RNA sequence: AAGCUUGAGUCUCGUAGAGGGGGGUAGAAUUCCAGGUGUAGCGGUGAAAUGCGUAGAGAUCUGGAGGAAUACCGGUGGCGAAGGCGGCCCCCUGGACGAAGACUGACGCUCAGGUGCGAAAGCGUGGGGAGCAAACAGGAUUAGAUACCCUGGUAGUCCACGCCGUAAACGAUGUCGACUUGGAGGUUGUGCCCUUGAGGCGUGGCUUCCGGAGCUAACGCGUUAAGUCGACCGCCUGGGGAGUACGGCCGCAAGGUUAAAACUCAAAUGAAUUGACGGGGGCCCGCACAAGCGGUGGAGCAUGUGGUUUAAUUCGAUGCAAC
């Protein structure tokens, strides 16, 4: 994409929210290539998050994703093989994409029954800005605005 | 020279005026400058600049 | 050219020719035909006179046990003498490089420490200790002086019935020992067809000064490894594939070094050699 | 020696290193730290790091003199007039103004000429 | 044979300049040389290390020197014979325009010998030394290093002179002069328009390029010639063998200077095309990067191969591809 750069594809959302945020995100887990059954165990978590948010399942996500999402980043493409290190604004397609992924990437293969829990336990934590995913918002921005010496 | 640095202190915002100051003349004094290289020069003395 | 086929061993590389000492023992400076090419000094050859000039039209260079770039010099070298002194700087990798090679080649090193006499009580000892690393590793050390050409009999006897060779660096008195051995100086040096000599107690020796100030030759990775068999044993030590003899978790070879179960030098040398081919 | 809490950050950057003295504005020397005195004695001191730390290590240990206003008076061209100035302004100071200092050499002495490989 | 003057020459008068000798000198510095604070460094490098500092050094601050050394002068500016010339006086000085007649009145051109001067090392031979670098050396890697790499130094530099006469002492353009493209440029005099700043604007002399024809092989050059002329002076003679021996010579010497053969080859070159490589570069693309996602591989397991066994473990299997 050296000629014309890009985000994601064939995504599928919610028949109850229609939220893309939730769509690109529900999706992420797939590499099961079917969120005809993916989505379910995250809702138990987002439900426990729904409560934990004081909102619904939709907006259980929302809160935790807005914590999670980066507002800046540092970007690489390697111009000349060069070590890019200058602070940049994380593009939305990343904001979202990476963020959504980050939450999901923080409740993985584990040690006990039900992801429902596993997710639940990730979810509110990301709600509280002390999730893993939100800490990637709060680590990428730390590298930003403190290095600019190299090209 | 100065950029009223009240903040800046890594960068200096200076690359102008080297002709009796900084890297220009100061790198060429107690380091060797040869005579079997600007002996090219006689003929070659105006070409390698912007580069 | 043609002549009468006769056997000989190539006594010398006569530059342009090769000089062949016949089966009888008669040396004939011979030509070497466009037709033959697998010739080296030491080859048993069919050489023919003319109808001296000879011509060579058959050779016999037996199997590899040493090269430069990667091209056998001879054969029946059952022992490689890695002969050293410190000229003009030196390193443990350099002797080891030769050792790794001796080990690879399956030609016996007899590690000869020249200038033993030169080396003070401390120096001789230090050097012996170093010589010992290799020795411990399996490569016997013979203390000789380059100059004094000491331990000459133990060396000679090691030479008996076999062919030996002189390896090292800038006339590290290798040249000196060679002179003793011969009992005639044929080389000094200080800071693939060449010439061969025959031993009286049995066996032979091959020499060239050119070899002696050093550069080094092309090789492959496995050979370096062959240079160190203790690594095989370490390869088995972690995993059914031990990283790669070098660091990475579960590199036994590396561990064995960390332990000191292997000497460090072997690993180090493994690297100088490894890098050079690459 | 002296203080006025206004100082100078003499940065004595140096080829394989960078040595830094923070000095009172008035003079003295108040701290000093090097870059090849930020240990380093290799490509390491030939790092900016060498300086970063160099300056830093100087720049702290001059504030005994209360220094927190520095002009930076960049001297030396070692890998440390970034890192070192880093660690000079930002080293318990507000940098009050930057400058670089130089004269009209006319020398005497012969320096080296040795190499040719 | 006598004249001209016109060339020349000369004598009349601008103008710029790093030309010089010899020296005034200036202000900085290199370096010299020192503490304090300050503090462990400095230092260096491939990578380091010797070195050094730690003794306070370096740093930095504080002090001065030493002896040595002088940007932007830097403009196709300008000056020089060149070989070559820019830190500030003075001199001594060399060389030099435009603008003036004129006169002398051919004083013109060029040069083998010869000759002056002739970059540097060097050198003689002493200077010089505040300092550096052959040689020569520690560390120092490095294949080898004895290289890299680092920690130093006499000649000579750092000084005076003598002593080379060679320096790709090269557009490898000899001299001189004349003759041969438009164009668009430079400097430096000076003409002129309100001097329109001295200006604005001629013209010289001089500088740039392009600049034609031409030429050249061609490159290119192309009036800056690499284009037409002359004299003059000097050149080339296939390539090596050779600023060197013989030889002879200059030189203290270095060594120059000068100045070989056999031998040796059927060859030596310019420029040019069309090239492709470049420890080149300049430029883009591509699950190539990149941003992800997952994969392979690992365990257990396969399949093929390898390997081994096997009598065979049947031939065709190899980056990628055993598959």
Curated annotation (Swiss-Prot), chain B:
Keyword Ribosomal protein belongs to the record: yes
Signal peptide coordinates: none
Disulfide bonds: none
Key words of the record: Ribonucleoprotein, Ribosomal protein
GO molecular function: structural constituent of ribosome
One cellular-component annotation, GO: ribonucleoprotein complex
Domain of life: Bacteria
Any single biological process term in GO: translation
Basic residues bias (residue ranges): 43-51
Family statement: Belongs to the bacterial ribosomal protein bS21 family.
Name the UniProt record assigns to this protein: Small ribosomal subunit protein bS21
Organism the protein comes from: Escherichia coli (strain SMS-3-5 / SECEC)
The organism's taxonomic lineage, starting at the top: Bacteria, Pseudomonadati, Pseudomonadota, Gammaproteobacteria, Enterobacterales
From Swiss-Prot, chain D:
Family named by the database record: Belongs to the universal ribosomal protein uS11 family.
Subunit structure: Part of the 30S ribosomal subunit. Interacts with proteins S7 and S18. Binds to IF-3.
Disulfide bridges in this chain: none
Origin species: Escherichia coli O8 (strain IAI1)
Biological process terms in GO annotation: translation
Any Pfam family matching the protein: Ribosomal_S11
Keyword Ribosomal protein set for record: yes
UniProt name for this protein: Small ribosomal subunit protein uS11
